[PDB]
């Protein structure tokens, strides 16, 4: 159940499996806060 995540500071893609994660962080810059990327499935928003 691994998934891709976006780092809060550097913004690069971070790949890890939250089910069996001993520790979740961005290895590129050491940041411990990650953002879930927006899905590419098209969403429809009513104009006002």
């Amino acid at each position: 159940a691994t998934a891709v995540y976006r780092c809060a500071k550097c913004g690069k893609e971070v790949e890890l499996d939250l089910a069996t994660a001993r520790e979740v962080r961005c290895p590129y810059c050491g940041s411990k806060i990650l953002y879930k990327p927006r899905p590419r499935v098209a969403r429809r928003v009513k104009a006002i």
Binding site: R6, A8, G11, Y35, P37, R38
Partner: protein, 65 residues
């Protein structure tokens, strides 16, 4: 945070001429004459252009992803 497209009272488009108005204001000219030459005659559209403050540039710096 961004200039509204239309005036809230009559729907007159003002976002096109807002940046020109802001640039002319920063040059030291009287904003009333700037609004006059830009076709902004009704004071409701003048209200929309004058009272608006740009803040989107300070929100873009905080990335969300």
């Amino acid at each position: 945070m961004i200039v509204p497209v239309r005036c809230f009272t009559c729907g007159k488009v003002l976002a096109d001429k807002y940046y020109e108005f802001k640039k002319r204001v920063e040059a030291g000219e009287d904003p009333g004459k700037v609004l006059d030459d830009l076709g902004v005659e009704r004071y409701c559209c003048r209200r929309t252009l004058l009272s608006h403050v740009e803040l989107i540039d300070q929100v873009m710096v905080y990335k969300v992803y």
